Design a protein around this ligand. Structure first.
Ligand code: HEA
Ligand code: HEA
Ligand SMILES: CCCCC/C=C\C/C=C/C/C=C\C/C=C\CCCC(=O)O[C@H](COC(=O)CCCCCCCCCCCCCCCCC)COP(=O)(O)OCCN
Ligand SMILES: CCCCCC/C=C\CCCCCCCCCC(=O)O[C@H](COC(=O)CCCCCCCCCCCCCCC)COP(=O)(O)OC[C@@H](O)CO
Ligand SMILES: CCCCCC/C=C\CCCCCCCCCC(=O)O[C@H](COC(=O)CCCCCCCCCCCCCCC)COP(=O)(O)OC[C@@H](O)CO
Ligand SMILES: [Cu+2]
Ligand SMILES: [Cu+2]
Ligand SMILES: [Cu+2]
Ligand SMILES: [Mg+2]
Ligand code: NA
Ligand SMILES: [Zn+2]
Lengths: 512, 78, 102, 47, 258, 70, 55, 227, 46, 91, 137, 43, 72
C-alpha cells in the first residue's frame, strides 16, 4: 500500500507532492553549493584548495538550482497539484507517464552527484562548452555523467510537457474555452510548449558533444573542421527559452497571489497577460545569440540580437503594470504570500532592467563574463523565481497539507531572506562594472570589499533557509487545520477542502 | 610599390572573423608563386601576399600548414 | 451611466416591496465594490429594505460600510448620518457609534 | 496578544543584538575590508 | 465517475522505466570508460520488459477493458502529435550542425565542401533507391489505412505487410551502405554529420517498423475495429514523419553536399 | 454639514499622485544628468583639453613604471 | 485465425480486484518479478560501480 | 585597473570606452526612472483604505502599455547601435599584433616585419616585488605604441579563453581555429590591465593581460631589442 | 481506500512532532551536507 | 470483410458512451449543457450522482472569470455574481 | 463543512452568506423574536445582541492595527544578528591569513605606484591626488 | 482566513529544542569538515 | 479509397522501387579505392573506440576504410 501509493502512483496530487519533496531536498544541496562558492570568495586567497574544485562547485550549483529545484517545484510540484484542480479535471491526461517524469529525476540527480565524485568532476560551467568539456581538457567520465544527467532531466520535462499540454487543451469542462482558464494554467501551458521545442535541440547538442568525446566525431573540434561556436548556438537556442521556462510558472503564481491577497475576484486585464505570456514565449526563441556578443559575430547580426532582445521588455511590462493594477483598489491582506509577491514585482523588475542593459551588444562587450551578469540573473532567479516559489508555497501549503503555517514566523522568514539576497547580489553590480570576471576562484585585491559583503549576505540567506525548515516542522507539529478559505468562488482549487480527497472531480463540474 | 606597415583593410573580409583572410593570402602567395613560375615571371611580385599572411596568420598555423604541404597533406588547393 | 441614473437604479433596487434577504446582501455587497460612497438616498432605501426584512443588524452593518468606504475623507459619514437621521430615528436605527461597535 | 504584551521588547532587544554582534564582527575579528587609500594610506616608495 | 476519462491503475512501469534509463546511461559510461557492457546490457533488457509491459497494459485497458472513450482517444492524438513535434526539433539540431559545417567549410577541410579526401556516395545510386522505398511504403500504408476503415481485413494485412517489408528493405540497404561507405564516422565533420544524422534516422526507421509490426499482430488478433484503431494511426503518423525526415536528409546531406 | 465629494475618490487620488510620480522619477533626471552624467562628460573634456601625452609619459618613465622605457 | 477478443474482454473485466499489470495471470506476476529483480539489482550494481569509479 | 571600493567603470582609456561610459549613464537614468517609479507605484497602491474591487476594464490602459514602452526602447537602441557601428568602422591600422590564449598564459606575436614572439605569465604572489599588484602582473607586458590604431587578432591553441582589457572597452573571445579581430587605440601612455574572460580550467583566475603603452619611438627600440 | 485528510496524504508520518523533527532534520540536513562531503572526497583524493 | 465494428466489439465505458449517444443522452458529461432563462420557475437543472455538484457560472459570454460554487440537493441557489438560478436533480 | 456557505468578516463583503451564530439558544431565539416590532423599543443592549447574533467582529475590531510588526522586525534582527555569529566562527576556524599584499608597508607602496602609473586619472583614483601639493586633494 | 486552536499547544521548551535542532544539525557536519580542511591537504 | 491506393501500391509505387532496385544493383560494382593520403582532418582519433583494438570504426571495411596509418 505504501509502495503502491508512493512508487506506483497514478495520482496528480501525490505525484506533485513527490516533486515538492524532491525540489526541497535539491534546494538544500543547491544552497550548500552556493555557500561553498561564497566561502571561497569571502576573503582574498584560496580556500577549497584548487580552482578545479571551485569550477565543479559553481557548475553543480547551477544545475541543481535550475534542473532539480526550480523546475521540479514549479512545474512538477505546483503544476501537477494545481492544474487538474483549476480546470476541474479528475487527473492528468497520462497519469502513468506522469509518474515516470518524476522517477527520472532521482536517477538524473544521482548521475550529477556521480560526475562530481569521479575523476576531478566537471568544472565546465553549466553551459558545458567544448573545447573545455572535451576528452583532452576534461578527460574521464565526469562530463559524460553530466551529459547523461541532462538527457534524463530533458526526457522528464518533454514527457511532462506532453502531459501538461494534452491535459490543458483536452480536459477542461466542455463549456470552458481556453480564455476562461486561470492564468497559472496558461503559464504552465506556454512553459510546456517552450520545453517541448527547446530541450530537443539541447539534447541534439549534448549528444554531439558526447560523440565528440567518445566516438571520434568532430562537430566542435577545430582540428577536424568543426566549430566550438556551433555548440554555443545549439546550447543557447535552448538556453534562452530555458530562462523563460524558469520564470513563466512564477508569473502565473504571482498573478494568483496578487489577485487573491488584493481581495479581487480576477487579475487586471486577463487577455493582455495571456497575450504577454504568448509573446514572452515566442520572442524567447529568437534572441539566443545575446549570450554570444563577444564570440566574433557580424555587426548586423549583433544589431539584430540587440533589438530583438529589447522587444521582450514590452510584453514583460504589460504584466508588471497589470499586477500593480490588480493591487489598485484592493482590500490588501498583508499575508506572508503577499509579501513574497510584492518583493517579486520589485526585485524581478530590477533584474529585468539590468537584462536590458546587457541586451546592448556594445555595452555587453565590457559586461560579458563579469559579475554584472551574475547580478542580473540572481535578481531574476534568486529573487524572482525563488520569491514566486516561496509565495506559492506559503499560499498553497494549507491546501496541500490541511494545516496552516504560523504567519508571524513566515513574515520573519521573508524579512531575513529579503535582507540576505539583496546584501548578497546588489554589490555584485559594482564588481561587474569594475571588471571582476565570472568563474574566478580568487580576485585582485581591489575587489575585496564587495566580495566580503556579498559572502556575508549569503550567510543571512542560509539562516533564512534553516528557519524555513523549522517553520514547516512547526506547522506539521502543531496540527492547526483549515476552517474556511475566503474567495473560493474564484479559486476552484480550494473548493474540495484541505487537503482535497485523493479523487476529486469524479463527478465533473458549466452552462454554455 | 611596397613600404608596408601592416595588412590593409580588405572589403572582402570586413567583419571580426578574419580566419579566411589569413588562409586566403597564405593560399594566394602559393597559387601566385606557381602561376608566375609557369610564365617565367618574377616570384618577387607575389610578396604582397606574403607580407599580408605573415602579418595576419598565427605562427603555429603557418608552421602546421608548411609541415603539411611538405608531408603532402595540405587540405587546400595550391 | 450618469450619476442620477446610477443612483436611481439602486434606489429602485432596494425599494422593491418583496426583497429577499439574498438580494439585500447581493446589492450591498455589489455596491461597495464601486468607487463611490453611496448617496444618502441609496443607503436609506437599503435601510428601509432591512426593515421590511426585519433585519436590524444589517441596518447597522450598512452604516458601518458607508463609513469604511469613505476612508480618509472624514466628512462623508457625518453628512450621510445627518441626511439619514430622519430614517434612522423612525425605523429605530441606532448608529454603529451609539451601540459602541466603533 | 503575544505582540501587545512583548512586541516592544522584541523590536528593542533584537535590534541592539544585531547592531552589537555585527559591530563586533566588522571591527574586532580582523576582517580585511580593504577600503580606498584615498585619504587613508600615505604612499611610500615602491622601488 | 461521471466523466469519460481514464483513471489508471497504480503501475510499476514508470519506476522500472526510469531505473532502466539510469542503467542505460550508467551503462554507456561504464562501456566508454571502464570497458564493460554489463550495466548497459541490463539497462536495455529492463527497458524492453518495462515497455512490453507498459504497452501491453495500454492494449489491455483499451481493447479488453474499454477505457478509451472518444475523449481519451483525442488526448492520445494530441500526445502523439506533440511527441512527433519534439522528434522534429531533435533532428533540426542535426540539420543545423550540417548547414553550419557545410556553408562555411573551415581551412582544415580545405575551405570547400565536401572536405578534401571525401568521396561521397552518388546521390543517384543506392540513396535514390532508399528514397523510392520509403515513399512507396507511404503509399502502401495509406492503402492499409483505407482497407481497415473499409473493414477489409485481408487487404489491410496485405498492405501493412508490404509496408513493413519495405521498411526492412530500407534498413538492410542502409546497413549495406554503411559497410561499403569509403568514409567513416571519424572522417571529420563530414562523417560526423553523415553518420549521426542518418544513424538516428535509421534508428527511427527501426522503431517505426517495430511499431508497424506490433500493429500487424494486433490486426491479426482482431484488436482494431473499422472505426477505433489509434495504435495504427499513431504508427502511420510516425511512419510519415520518418519518411519526411529522410526526404530532408537526402536533399541536404547527399544531393546538396555531394 | 456641506455635501462632500463622494464619487471617484480612489481614481482622484491616483490621478493626483500620478502627476507626482513622474516628478519624483524625472526628479532623478534634470538631476542625475547633473551629478554623474554631466560631471563625467565635463571631466573628460577638461582632462583632455590641454593634455600633453608626452609629458605624461615622461613623468611615468621617470617614476620607473615601464619595462621598455627606463 | 478467429476473433477471441470477447474472451480476453471477459478475462480482463473479471472482478478480482487485480491491477491491469497482473490481471492476465501468473505469468504477469512472473514477468513483473523478473523486471523488478533486474531493475533494483542493476541499480545496486550501478551504485557499487559509482563507488569503484569515484575512488 | 580597478581600485578599492569602485562602484562604476574603470576610467576610459580609449575614445570608444568613453562613448560607452556616456551610453551607460543614459541607460542607468532610464533604469533609475522605471525601477523607482515601480517601487513608488507599489507603495501608492498599498497605502489607501479606499477600494474599487469591481471589474476594471483595460480599454485604453492597454494602448499606452504597448505604444509608450516601445518609444523608450528606441531611445536606448539608437545610441547603442550608433556605438555598435562606430566600433566596426574601417580603422586603417598601423600595426597588427596577435595573441594566442593557452592553458594559463597568453603569447604574443608581432610579425609585421620581423618575429617578436613571447609568452606572458602571471608573476606569482610569492615572487611579486614590493608594490606589484597581486594576480595582475605579468613577466612580459604587451608593449604597444600609444595614440595609434592597432589591430589585435585573438585566437587560442587549446580551449576557449577571452582577451579583455576593461579600460579600453575590449573583450574578444580566443577560439581555437578562429582568428577574431578587434582594434585598440589608447589616448594615453601607461599600464592597462585585464584578465582571461572565459572559463578555461583550473587556472582561469591566473592569466592576466598587461598592456604597456609608450610613444612610437620607444615602441620601435623595444621591438628591436626583443628579437 | 487511501486514507484521506490532513497528515495522511504524505509519504512520511506527522503523528509525533519529535520523530518528524528527526526525519526532517535528516532529509533536509543530509541534502545540505552532501555538497560538503563531495569537497572532502575531492580534496582527499589528491 | 473480417474487421469488427464498434457495435460488435466496443466494451466497458467506451460502449456505454456509445450506446448512450444513440439514445440522445449524456451520462458522462461529454457535452456542455445549454442554459435555460435561469429564473426561479425554470432553474437550470444540474444532474448529480450525489447531494452536491460544483457549478461554474460564466455570467455573461466573454467573461474570462468563472464563478464557482457548490449546488446542494434541495431548493435552488443563485450565482453569487449574476444571480442566475440552478437546482440539483437526480442522475 | 467546506461545501457549505460560511461566515466571513470582510470590509468589502459586509453582509456574509450566513449568520455567525446559527444554533440560536432560547434566550437568543427570543432576541430574534423581539426584532419583529418597532426598533425604537429594542433597548441598546438588545440592539447589540441582535448585531452580535448576525456578525462576529464589528468593522472597527476587524480593522484593528496590531503589534505584530515589532515582533517580526525584532526577530528578523535577532536572526540576522545570529548570522554574524556564524561569520565570526568562520573567520576564526576556517579562514587562514590573507595575502601579504594587504599589509600596510605593501598597500602604501602599491598606492604610490598606482599614482605613478596614473590609475584612473580622469575621475576614479589619481584624479583624487594633487600631484602639485603632493597629497590627497 | 482563520485557523482552529491547536490540539497540542507548543511550550517554550518545546520550541527551544526544535529550533536548536534545526540549527545545530546543519552546522556540525559543515563545521567538522570546513575546520579540518588543512588536515586533508597534507598528503 | 482503398481501390485507388491498392493500385498505387502495386502499379506506381512498387514499379518505381523495381526500376530503382535494378538501377543500383546493375549500376554498382565494388568501388575502386583511392590512394591513401594522410590528411589531418580525416581518420580522427582523440580517444580509442570502446570496441576491438580501439582503432577500427564500427562498420570498418578493410577494402575501403584505411586506418590512420594506411589501408591494412
Ligand atoms: C534558480 C537558480 C539559482 C539560484 C536560486 C541561485 C542562488 C544563489 N547563487 Fe547562484 N548561480 C546560478 C543559479 C542560481 N543561483 C547559475 C545558473 C549560476 C552560473 C553557473 C555557471 O557560471 O556555470 C550561478 C552562479 C553563482 C555565482 C557565481 C560563481 C562564479 O562565477 O564564480 C555565485 C556567486 O556568489 C552564486 C551565488 C548564489 C547564492 C549565494 C545563492 C543564494 O541566494 C541561495 C539561497 C537559497 C535559496 C534561494 C534556495 C531556497 C529554495 C529552496 C531551498 C526550496 C524550498 C522548498 C520549498 C519551498 C518546497 N551563484
Ligand atoms: C529567470 C531567468 C531570466 C529572465 C526572466 C531573464 C530576463 C532577461 N534577460 Fe537574462 N539571463 C539569465 C536569466 C534570465 N534572464 C541567466 C541565467 C543568464 C546568464 C546565463 C549564462 O551565460 O551563464 C542571463 C544573461 C543575460 C544575457 C547575456 C548577458 C551576457 O552574458 O552576455 C542577456 C543579454 O542581453 C540578458 C537579457 C535579458 C532581458 C532583456 C530579459 C527580459 O526578460 C527582461 C525584461 C523585463 C524588464 C525590462 C522589467 C519589467 C518591464 C518594465 C517595468 C517595462 C518597462 C521597461 C523598459 C521600457 C525597459 N540576460
Ligand atoms: C543502418 C541503419 C541503422 C542505424 C544505426 C546504426 C547502428 C549503430 C548506431 C545506432 C543508432 C543510434 C544512435 C547512435 C547515433 C550516433 C552514432 C552512431 C551512428 C552510426 O550508426 O553510424 C556508424 C557509427 O558507428 C558507431 O560509432 C556506433 C557506436 C554506437 C554507440 C552509440 C552511443 C550512444 C549515443 C547516444 C547517446 C544517448 C542519447 C541519445 C539521445 C537521447 C536524448 C535525450 C557508422 O560507422 P562507421 O563505420 O564509423 O562508418 C562506415 C564506415 N565503413
Ligand atoms: C540512453 C540515453 C537516454 C535514455 C533515456 C530513456 C528514457 C526512458 C526510457 C524508458 C521509457 C519506455 C517505457 C514506455 C513509455 C510509454 C509512455 C506512453 O505510451 O504514454 C502514453 C501517453 O503518451 C502518449 O501517448 C504520447 C507520447 C508517447 C511517448 C513515448 C515514450 C518514449 C520515451 C523516450 C523519449 C525521448 C524524447 C524524444 C525527443 C528527443 C500512455 O500514457 P499512460 O499514462 O501510460 O496511460 C494513459 C492511459 O489512458 C492509456 O490507456
Ligand atoms: C525491438 C527493436 C529495438 C529498438 C527499440 C524500440 C522499440 C520500441 C518502440 C516501438 C514502439 C512500439 C509501440 C507499441 C504501442 C502499442 C500500444 C498502443 O498502441 O496502444 C494504443 C493506444 O495508443 C497509444 O498509447 C499510442 C502510444 C504510442 C507510443 C509509442 C511511440 C514511439 C516510441 C518511441 C520510443 C523511443 C523514441 C525515440 C527517441 C530517440 C491502443 O489503443 P487502440 O489502438 O486505440 O485500441 C483500442 C481499440 O482496439 C478498441 O477496439
Ligand atoms: Cu538569454
Ligand atoms: Cu584562460
Ligand atoms: Cu580563462
Ligand atoms: Mg564568455
Ligand atoms: Na578565494
Ligand atoms: Zn453567474
Amino acid at each position: 500500500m505504501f509502495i503502491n501509493r508512493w512508487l506506483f502512483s497514478t495520482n496528480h496530487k501525490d505525484i506533485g507532492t513527490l516533486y515538492l519533496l524532491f525540489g526541497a531536498w535539491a534546494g538544500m544541496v543547491g544552497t550548500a553549493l552556493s555557500l561553498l562558492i561564497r566561502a571561497e570568495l569571502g576573503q582574498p586567497g584560496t580556500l577549497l584548495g584548487d580552482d578545479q574544485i571551485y569550477n565543479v562547485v559553481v557548475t553543480a550549483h547551477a544545475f541543481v538550482m535550475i534542473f532539480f529545484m526550480v523546475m521540479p517545484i514549479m512545474i512538477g510540484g505546483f503544476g501537477n497539484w494545481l492544474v487538474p484542480l483549476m480546470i476541474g479535471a479528475p487527473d492528468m491526461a497520462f497519469p502513468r507517464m506522469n509518474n515516470m517524469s518524476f522517477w527520472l529525476l532521482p536517477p538524473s540527480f544521482l548521475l550529477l552527484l556521480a560526475s562530481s565524485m569521479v575523476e576531478a568532476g566537471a568544472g565546465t560551467g553549466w553551459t558545458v562548452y567544448p573545447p573545455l568539456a572535451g576528452n583532452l581538457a576534461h578527460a574521464g567520465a565526469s562530463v559524460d555523467l553530466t551529459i547523461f544527467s541532462l538527457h534524463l532531466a530533458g526526457v522528464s520535462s518533454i514527457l511532462g510537457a506532453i502531459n501538461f499540454i494534452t491535459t490543458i487543451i483536452n480536459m477542461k469542462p466542455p463549456a470552458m474555452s481556453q480564455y476562461q482558464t486561470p492564468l497559472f494554467v496558461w503559464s504552465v501551458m506556454i512553459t510546456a510548449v517552450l520545453l517541448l521545442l527547446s530541450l530537443p535541440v539541447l539534447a541534439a547538442g549534448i549528444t554531439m558533444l558526447l560523440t565528440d568525446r567518445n566516438l571520434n566525431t568532430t562537430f566542435f573540434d577545430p582540428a577536424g573542421g568543426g566549430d566550438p561556436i556551433l555548440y554555443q548556438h545549439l546550447f543557447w537556442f535552448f538556453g534562452h527559452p530555458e530562462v523563460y521556462i524558469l520564470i513563466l510558472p512564477g508569473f502565473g503564481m504571482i498573478s494568483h497571489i496578487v489577485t487573491y491577497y488584493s481581495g479581487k475576484k480576477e487579475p487586471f486585464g486577463y487577455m493582455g497577460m495571456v497575450w504577454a505570456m504568448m509573446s514572452i514565449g515566442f520572442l524567447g526563441f529568437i534572441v539566443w545569440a545575446h549570450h554570444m556578443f563577444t564570440v566574433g559575430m557580424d555587426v548586423d547580426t549583433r544589431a539584430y540580437f540587440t533589438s530583438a532582445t529589447m522587444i521582450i521588455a514590452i510584453p514583460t511590462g504589460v504584466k508588471v503594470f497589470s499586477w500593480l493594477a490588480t493591487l489598485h483598489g484592493g482590500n490588501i491582506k498583508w499575508s506572508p504570500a503577499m509579501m513574497w509577491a510584492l518583493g517579486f514585482i520589485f526585485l524581478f523588475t530590477v533584474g529585468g532592467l539590468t537584462g536590458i542593459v546587457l541586451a546592448n551588444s556594445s555595452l555587453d562587450i565590457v559586461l560579458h563574463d563579469t559579475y554584472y551578469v551574475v547580478a542580473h540573473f540572481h535578481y531574476v532567479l534568486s529573487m524572482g523565481a525563488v520569491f514566486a516559489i516561496m509565495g506559492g508555497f506559503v499560499h498553497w501549503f494549507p491546501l496541500f497539507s490541511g494545516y496552516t503555517l504560523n504567519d508571524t514566523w513566515a513574515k520573519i522568514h521573508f524579512a531575513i531572506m529579503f535582507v540576505g539576497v539583496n546584501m548578497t547580489f546588489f554589490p555584485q553590480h559594482f564588481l561587474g562594472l569594475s571588471g571582476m570576471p565570472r568563474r574566478y576562484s580568487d580576485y585582485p585585491d581591489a575587489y575585496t570589499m564587495w566580495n566580503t559583503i556579498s559572502s556575508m549576505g549569503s550567510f543571512i540567506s542560509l539562516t533564512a533557509v534553516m528557519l524555513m525548515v523549522f517553520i514547516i516542522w512547526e506547522a506539521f507539529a502543531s496540527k492547526r487545520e483549515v476552517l474556511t478559505v475566503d474567495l473560493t468562488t474564484t479559486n476552484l482549487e480550494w473548493l474540495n477542502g484541505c487537503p482535497p480527497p485523493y479523487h476529486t472531480f469524479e463527478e465533473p463540474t458549466v452552462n454554455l | 610599390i611596397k613600404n608596408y606597415q601592416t595588412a590593409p583593410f580588405d572589403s572582402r573580409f570586413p567583419n571580426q572573423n578574419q580566419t579566411r583572410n589569413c588562409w586566403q593570402n597564405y593560399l594566394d602567395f602559393h597559387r601566385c608563386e606557381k602561376a608566375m613560375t609557369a610564365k617565367g615571371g618574377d616570384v618577387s611580385v607575389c610578396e604582397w601576399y606574403r607580407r599580408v599572411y605573415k602579418s595576419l596568420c598565427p605562427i603555429s598555423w603557418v608552421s602546421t600548414w608548411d609541415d603539411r604541404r611538405a608531408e603532402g597533406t595540405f587540405p587546400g588547393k595550391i | 451611466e450618469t450619476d442620477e441614473e446610477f443612483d436611481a437604479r439602486w434606489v429602485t433596487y432596494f425599494n422593491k416591496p418583496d426583497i429577499d434577504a439574498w438580494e439585500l446582501r447581493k446589492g450591498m455587497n455589489t455596491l461597495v465594490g464601486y468607487d463611490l460612497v453611496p448617496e444618502p438616498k441609496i443607503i436609506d432605501a437599503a435601510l428601509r429594505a432591512c426593515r421590511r426584512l426585519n433585519d436590524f443588524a444589517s441596518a447597522v452593518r450598512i452604516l458601518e460600510v458607508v463609513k469604511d468606504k469613505a476612508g480618509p475623507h472624514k466628512e462623508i459619514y457625518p453628512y450621510v448620518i445627518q441626511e439619514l437621521r430622519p430614517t434612522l430615528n423612525e425605523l429605530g436605527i441606532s448608529t454603529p457609534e451609539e451601540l459602541g461597535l466603533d | 496578544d503575544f505582540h501587545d504584551k512583548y512586541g516592544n521588547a522584541v523590536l528593542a532587544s533584537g535590534a541592539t543584538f544585531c547592531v552589537a554582534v555585527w559591530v563586533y564582527m566588522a571591527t574586532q575579528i580582523g576582517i580585511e575590508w580593504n577600503p580606498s587609500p584615498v585619504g587613508r594610506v600615505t604612499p611610500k616608495e615602491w622601488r | 465517475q461521471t466523466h469519460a476519462y481514464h483513471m489508471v491503475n497504480p503501475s510499476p512501469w514508470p519506476l522500472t522505466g526510469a531505473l532502466s534509463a539510469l542503467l542505460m546511461t550508467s551503462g554507456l559510461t561504464m562501456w566508454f570508460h571502464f570497458n564493460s557492457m554489463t550495466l548497459l546490457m541490463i539497462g536495455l533488457t529492463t527497458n524492453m520488459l518495462t515497455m512490453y509491459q507498459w504497452w501491453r497494459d495500454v492494449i489491455r485497458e483499451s481493447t479488453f477493458q474499454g477505457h478509451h472513450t472518444p475523449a481519451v482517444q483525442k488526448g492520445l492524438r494530441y500526445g502523439m502529435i506533440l511527441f512527433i513535434i519534439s522528434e522534429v526539433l531533435f533532428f533540426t539540431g542535426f540539420f543545423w550542425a550540417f548547414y553550419h559545417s557545410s556553408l562555411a567549410p573551415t581551412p582544415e577541410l580545405g575551405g570547400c565542401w565536401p572536405p578534401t579526401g571525401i568521396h561521397p556516395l552518388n546521390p543517384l545510386e543506392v540513396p535514390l533507391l532508399n528514397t523510392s522505398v520509403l515513399l512507396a511504403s507511404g503509399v502502401s500504408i495509406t492503402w492499409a489505412h483505407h482497407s481497415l476503415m473499409e473493414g477489409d481485413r485481408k487487404h489491410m494485412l496485405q498492405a501493412l505487410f508490404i509496408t513493413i517489408t519495405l521498411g526492412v528493405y530500407f534498413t538492410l540497404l542502409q546497413a549495406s551502405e554503411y559497410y561499403e561507405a569509403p568514409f567513416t564516422i571519424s572522417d571529420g565533420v563530414y562523417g560526423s554529420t553523415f553518420f549521426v544524422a542518418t544513424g538516428f534516422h535509421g534508428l527511427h526507421v527501426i522503431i517505426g517498423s517495430t511499431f508497424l509490426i506490433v500493429c500487424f499482430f494486433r490486426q491479426l488478433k482482431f484488436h482494431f475495429t473499422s472505426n477505433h484503431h489509434f495504435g495504427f494511426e499513431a504508427a502511420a503518423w510516425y511512419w510519415h514523419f520518418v519518411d519526411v525526415v529522410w526526404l530532408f536528409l537526402y536533399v541536404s546531406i547527399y544531393w546538396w553536399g555531394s | 454639514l456641506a455635501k462632500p465629494q463622494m464619487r471617484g475618490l480612489l481614481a482622484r487620488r491616483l490621478r493626483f499622485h500620478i502627476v507626482g510620480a513622474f516628478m519624483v522619477s524625472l526628479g532623478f533626471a534634470t538631476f542625475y544628468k547633473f551629478a554623474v552624467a554631466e560631471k563625467r562628460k565635463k571631466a573628460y573634456a577638461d582632462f583632455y583639453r590641454n593634455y600633453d601625452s608626452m609629458k605624461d609619459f615622461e613623468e611615468m618613465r621617470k617614476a620607473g613604471i615601464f619595462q621598455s622605457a627606463k | 485465425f478467429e476473433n477471441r477478443v470477447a474472451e480476453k474482454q471477459k478475462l480482463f473485466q473479471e472482478d478480482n480486484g487485480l491491477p491491469v499489470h497482473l490481471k492476465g495471470g501468473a505469468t504477469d506476476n512472473i514477468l513483473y518479478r523478473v523486471t523488478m529483480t533486474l531493475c533494483l539489482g542493476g541499480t545496486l550494481y550501478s551504485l557499487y560501480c559509482l563507488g569503484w569509479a569515484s575512488f | 585597473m580597478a581600485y578599492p571600493m569602485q562602484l562604476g567603470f574603470q576610467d576610459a582609456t580609449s575614445p570608444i570606452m568613453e562613448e560607452l561610459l556616456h551610453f551607460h549613464d543614459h541607460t542607468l537614468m532610464i533604469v533609475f526612472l522605471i525601477s523607482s517609479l515601480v517601487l513608488y507605484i507599489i507603495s501608492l497602491m498599498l497605502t489607501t483604505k479606499l477600494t474599487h474591487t469591481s471589474t476594471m476594464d483595460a480599454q485604453e490602459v492597454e494602448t499606452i502599455w504597448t505604444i509608450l514602452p516601445a518609444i523608450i526602447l528606441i531611445l536606448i537602441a539608437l545610441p547603442s547601435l550608433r556605438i555598435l557601428y562606430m566600433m566596426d568602422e574601417i580603422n586603417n591600422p598601423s600595426l597588427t599584433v596577435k595573441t594566442m590564449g593557452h592553458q594559463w598564459y597568453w603569447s604574443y606575436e608581432y610579425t609585421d616585419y620581423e618575429d617578436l614572439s613571447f609568452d606572458s605569465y602571471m608573476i606569482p604572489t610569492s615572487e611579486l616585488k614590493p608594490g606589484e599588484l597581486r594576480l595582475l602582473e605579468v613577466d612580459n607586458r604587451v608593449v604597444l605604441p600609444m595614440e595609434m590604431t592597432i589591430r589585435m587578432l585573438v585566437s587560442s591553441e587549446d580551449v576557449l579563453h577571452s582577451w579583455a582589457v576593461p579600460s579600453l572597452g575590449l573583450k574578444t573571445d580566443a577560439i581555437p581555429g578562429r582568428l577574431n579581430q578587434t582594434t585598440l587605440m589608447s589616448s594615453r601612455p601607461g599600464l592597462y590591465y585585464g584578465q582571461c574572460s572565459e572559463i578555461c580550467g583550473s587556472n582561469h583566475s591566473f592569466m592576466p593581460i598587461v598592456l604597456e603603452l609608450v610613444p612610437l619611438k620607444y615602441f620601435e627600440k623595444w621591438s628591436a631589442s626583443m628579437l | 481506500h487511501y486514507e484521506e485528510g490532513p497528515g495522511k496524504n504524505i509519504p512520511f508520518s506527522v503523528e509525533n512532532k519529535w520523530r518528524l523533527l528527526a526525519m526532517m532534520t535528516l532529509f533536509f540536513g543530509s541534502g545540505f551536507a552532501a555538497p560538503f562531503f563531495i569537497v572532502r572526497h575531492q580534496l582527499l583524493k589528491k | 470483410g473480417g474487421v469488427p465494428t464498434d457495435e460488435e466489439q466496443a466494451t466497458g465505458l467506451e460502449r456505454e458512451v456509445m450506446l448512450a449517444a444513440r439514445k440522445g443522452q449524456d451520462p458522462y458529461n461529454i457535452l456542455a449543457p445549454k442554459a435555460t432563462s435561469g429564473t426561479k420557475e425554470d432553474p437550470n437543472l444540474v444532474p448529480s450522482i450525489t447531494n452536491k455538484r460544483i457549478v461554474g457560472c460564466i455570467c455573461e459570454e466573454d467573461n474570462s472569470t468563472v464563478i464557482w460554487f457548490w449546488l446542494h440537493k434541495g431548493e435552488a441557489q443563485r450565482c453569487p455574481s449574476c444571480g442566475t438560478h440552478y437546482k440539483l436533480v437526480p442522475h | 463543512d467546506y461545501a457549505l456557505p460560511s461566515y466571513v468578516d470582510r470590509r468589502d463583503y459586509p453582509l456574509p452568506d450566513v449568520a455567525h451564530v446559527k444554533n440560536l439558544s432560547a434566550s437568543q431565539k427570543a432576541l430574534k423574536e423581539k426584532e419583529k416590532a418597532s426598533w425604537s423599543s429594542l433597548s441598546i443592549d438588545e440592539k447589540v445582541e441582535l448585531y452580535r447574533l448576525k456578525f462576529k467582529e464589528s468593522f472597527a475590531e476587524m480593522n484593528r492595527s496590531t503589534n505584530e510588526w515589532k515582533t517580526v522586525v525584532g526577530a528578523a534582527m535577532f536572526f540576522i544578528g545570529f548570522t554574524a555569529l556564524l561569520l565570526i566562527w568562520e573567520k576564526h576556524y576556517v579562514y587562514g591569513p590573507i595575502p601579504h599584499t594587504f599589509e600596510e608597508e605593501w598597500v602604501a607602496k602599491q598606492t604610490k605606484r598606482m599614482l605613478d602609473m596614473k590609475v584612473a586619472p580622469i575621475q576614479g583614483f589619481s584624479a583624487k591626488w594633487d600631484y602639485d601639493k603632493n597629497e590627497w586633494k | 482566513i482563520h485557523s482552529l486552536p491547536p490540539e497540542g499547544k507548543l511550550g517554550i521548551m518545546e520550541l527551544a529544542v526544535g529550533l536548536t535542532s534545526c540549527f545545530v544539525t546543519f552546522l556540525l557536519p559543515a563545521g567538522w569538515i570546513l575546520s579540518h580542511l588543512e588536515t586533508y591537504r597534507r598528503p | 479509397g482503398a481501390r485507388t491506393w491498392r493500385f498505387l501500391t502495386f502499379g506506381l509505387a512498387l514499379p518505381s522501387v523495381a526500376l530503382c532496385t535494378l538501377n543500383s544493383w546493375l549500376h554498382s560494382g565494388h568501388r575502386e579505392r583511392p590512394a591513401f593520403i594522410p590528411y589531418h582532418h580525416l581518420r580522427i582519433r582523440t580517444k580509442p573506440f570502446s570496441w576491438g583494438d580501439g582503432n577500427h570504426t564500427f562498420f570498418h571495411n578493410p577494402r575501403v576504410n584505411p586506418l590512420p596509418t594506411g589501408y591494412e
